[PDB]
Homo-oligomer: 93 residues x 2
């Protein structure tokens, strides 16, 4: 799995500004259909990840499945600062 | 299932601003572990949904699984206007 990307509010605005192509719209889903944690071994011992799954209707796309797969997408979580570890604090952009 | 939320760039930015109120950071993940289209059935026929699962490391949190479950989160997708259906175009804010 990928590293953690934690953003200050301003760096999160910058990140968006950088990633928003001129002619795009943003489809937003808060429809979480599953959420859980799983472990995986790495070359540096066992780790834990959260998995959050979101649903959203396909009827808004005139696009096939692999096209929607290819589209730039992100999950975002709003986390109060009291709820970070030391590691989560070290990571803040 | 919730209806689709589709925002123009400016509406999308206004929407997120409303969440950046407190001592809050934003955890962002593009680590899609699973992506597919699946049919959903009801009494009045079938509808296709996309499902997007994202992973993010747990060790950044000082929080159990139910607490991460409870935090505000969204999947967002960046879509070319020329890739929307007529209904998707319809629903822009």
């Amino acid at each position: 799995h990928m590293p953690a990307y934690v953003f200050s509010k301003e760096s999160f605005l910058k990140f968006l500004e950088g990633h928003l192509e001129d002619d795009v719209v943003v489809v937003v889903s808060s429809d979480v259909t599953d959420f859980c944690k799983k472990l995986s071994e790495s070359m540096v011992g066992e780790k834990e990840y959260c998995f959050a799954e979101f649903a959203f209707p396909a009827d808004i796309f005139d696009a096939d499945e692999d096209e929607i797969d290819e589209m730039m997408k992100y999950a975002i979580v709003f986390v109060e600062k009291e709820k970070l570890s030391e590691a989560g604090r070290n990571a803040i952009r």
